[PDB]
Design a protein around this nucleic acid. Sequence first.
RNA 1: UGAAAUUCUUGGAUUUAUUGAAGACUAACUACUGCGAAAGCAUUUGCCAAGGACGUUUUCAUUAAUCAAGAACGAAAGUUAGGGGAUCGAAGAUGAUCAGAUACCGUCGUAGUCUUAACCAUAAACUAUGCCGACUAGGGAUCGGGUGGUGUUUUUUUAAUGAC
Lengths: 127, 240, 163, 229, 121
Amino acid sequence: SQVFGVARIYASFNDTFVHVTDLSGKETIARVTGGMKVKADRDESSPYAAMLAAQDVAAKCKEVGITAVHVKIRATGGTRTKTPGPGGQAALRALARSGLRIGRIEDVTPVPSDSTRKKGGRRGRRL
Amino acid sequence: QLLKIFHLKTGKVVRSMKISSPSYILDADSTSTLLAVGGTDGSIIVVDIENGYITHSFKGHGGTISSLKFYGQLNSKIWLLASGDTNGMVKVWDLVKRKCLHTLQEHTSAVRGLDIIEVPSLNLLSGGRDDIINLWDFNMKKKCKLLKTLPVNQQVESCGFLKDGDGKRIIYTAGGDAIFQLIDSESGSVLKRTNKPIEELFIIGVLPILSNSQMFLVLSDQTLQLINVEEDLKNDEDTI
Amino acid sequence: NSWTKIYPPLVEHLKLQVRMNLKTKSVELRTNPKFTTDPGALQKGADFIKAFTLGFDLDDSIALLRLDDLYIETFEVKDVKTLTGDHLSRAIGRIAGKDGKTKFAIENATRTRIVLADSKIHILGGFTHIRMARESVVSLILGSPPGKVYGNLRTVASRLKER
Amino acid sequence: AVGKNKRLSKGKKGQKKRVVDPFTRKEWFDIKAPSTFENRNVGKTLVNKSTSASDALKGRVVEVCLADLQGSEDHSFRKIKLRVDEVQGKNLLTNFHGMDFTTDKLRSMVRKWQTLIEANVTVKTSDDYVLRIFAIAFTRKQANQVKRHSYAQSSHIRAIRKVISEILTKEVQGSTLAQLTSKLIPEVINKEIENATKDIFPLQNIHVRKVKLLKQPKFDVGALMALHG
Amino acid sequence: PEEMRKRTTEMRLMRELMFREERKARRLKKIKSKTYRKIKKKELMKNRELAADNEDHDIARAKERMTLKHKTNSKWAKDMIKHGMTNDAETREEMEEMLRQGERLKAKNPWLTLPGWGEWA
RNA sequence: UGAAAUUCUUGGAUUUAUUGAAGACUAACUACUGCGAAAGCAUUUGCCAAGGACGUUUUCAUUAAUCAAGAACGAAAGUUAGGGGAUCGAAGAUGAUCAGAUACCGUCGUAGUCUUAACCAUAAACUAUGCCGACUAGGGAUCGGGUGGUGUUUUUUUAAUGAC
Ligand SMILES: [Mg+2]
Ligand SMILES: [Mg+2]
Ligand SMILES: [Mg+2]
Ligand SMILES: [Mg+2]
Ligand SMILES: [Mg+2]
């Protein structure tokens, strides 16, 4: 009676992607981003944008028939920060508030055993 | 998940009530007083439109309700409700006794089309997306037999019984590819059919009008087409 | 030793069903169908206890239960700049400052909390608050002396009060 | 940004009218696990209806936690990859494709003041299944230890790594893929590693970190139906 | 017995406490910067004076009056003075601090238990 | 990005999943630890020779310390001639040129970053501290080796080793 999905959330510095899919992950059920629910580029990464996108995806999720999901949060990873930012947290909260049962939470950020050089250079970046 | 009853003449929302789960299937009896609600949780809610209270709450289906058919007549006690879920399960609920009278499983895919007609004994026409049509015969007793299974070549979005000019029983099936066709129950052959549009489209439903004289073919592209089958049925041409 | 002040808010206000498992050394929170009412309480409780798990004072962690728009920002020093040996060790000292004064300077101005878990930094506040804090701490990493940062911290503080 | 003030983009010129709901033509498909796993039901998936649906089903890989399949939270940190191979009446017959641990679990095990031993072996089963195993071990301190750390001399890690190598290769060579998976669930391999490596050095948190499937043999549906019973 | 486990338990703490107190030293030992060390020395004397007889003083002057160690005839002080090198203020302060400290020495029918520590709470 | 535009994108971008290919590089373990004359050195296994310390009731018998001349190595950058060219990236162009905490940002990116065979020989190449030898306080942490105990664990037959 309980059908499970996978809510893949990607929280970047400049935007948050909320994606729900089948257990295999190949079928997309609904994809909504921070830019979807906002007017200004500066507010794409805002938690408020994430909450609206989460609410949007949740409505479609119920519409299709999926009632539970397994959340796989991740960040940019690679040569950049590994921890999901506030936006993914807000989206994760929104899904819980949406009423969809949350199956399992995991962090699947790309962690490189070895990585190429970063964009900043020797003197750094992120002034 | 809020049912709202709106009165056209009065033009205000007479009744508002809450349902257990989202419901995408709504059926109103021909007598225009009862409404059956098919939720994705398998629960069936029957509401009196004029009064606005729950009359029946049938919870037997496991899958999502995909089709609901009210059977009844004015000044009769043989009132029945037929419900089909997405699991190919069909149940004939009896309103007067408030119980499930029959259970059918031969369908494998979702059941989208239901129709009961009285045999001068009652006949049920069940059609689903599995591209088959099943004709059942049954009564108030523990009798429910399958008569025929028609491979209709088309995904059955909606189906029902139709009467010819001479009185011959006919079955109308509107489905995928945006085609509406008519099949004799006995022969099983398609008498008449509509031309398939070049654009891929589906008939999401059919709306009987004027004692089944003309039907509105609702298409997935939000376009309604009116066909007068009774005149077309008289026409010898096999194209509607 | 702080558990006496942890379960009361969750079990009573949030109406959650709490337990900590010695065998796996983890905390357990379960929603009670007959008692729990808020759908978001369970995740909120999880959000709260994590904050303590990152190194946060309990009372600060309670703010996450009381409010809903408090988030955790996290990053490492190496993400900013690849400092090593003494360079890394000094850079940590810059952020804390003498007697930890610098860390308190940012926290008051920005209305957040900071834990300097070696090279790991975590920030709690409103989204606007944490982002500006990210700027101040990072500016220290790049080599800015704290005294100059202190002046900027004062500047942003006034803007916060006016609005 | 969806806003009006957002500057217009080229891609807005050529656009198809949204007239068909894909889910209408999507047909749900039920997924079943091999008989090795206690809970065979592992959910369902959807694909476009055949115009075929079968081709997209083949090669379909799904990852799922062992706890759901075995109904025990002892496997909460373990995930199993299943690939769809045969389809019958909406039932998707799947076979073992891989195994791995949750990231949070791994990061938990890695800790300060101890030595990490990572051994990997590329070996083939009796069923001509080439696979690569990754095993992780952690040094521990004795009950009456008093030193803060329990680092091990490089000769031990080489000795520990060797002993892990034979057992991993030994088990894979003398078993089929299905039998190997039967070993993974109770983790008898981990207990075997502990006993053999016990004398050399005290170890903790011994696990088979990951399993990879490099090459597959020629497909045999007869070998598949027996696995599903 | 089980008390051996306890005995191990204290010994681990002592070593780990020693390791921490150790850990703070070489990092501090490596920081030799006169501004930093001067600040540390300044506050140390203030704490010394607040928290923590003439015979010792006479002996202290007695050594100072014979050795003559704290005037500008010393190797370091003579080296700075003769070369126009103490005219810079910072080194003059050190030279003057030396003289005062030397000067100081020379001074004289009816109708018919923890909840939830280990169990679910 | 503080805020944006060049820029890619309905021939489908980004995102999802099963793979494959190219070139670097060995995260987390990583520590007030180890090895090397220094510069430097972190995946698995094999071959090659090399090395400190320890043990020795084994051997040669002053063969030694320092070192102008002379010789080997020598961070990164750089030069010559091939290979390779994933990432980054001096130089350079170009989007934007509004706002001082976020005020130097983005896209493209040559030489270079890698490797083969050769050149240069400079650093806060720091312990701002020559090398060799003797002597001059207590304490316990760590690394390698050795010695001792009728100490714990393990060998789940003992044991002996291994770890404490
Ligand atoms: Mg080592
Ligand atoms: Mg050395
Ligand atoms: Mg070249
Ligand atoms: Mg150096
Ligand atoms: Mg000496």
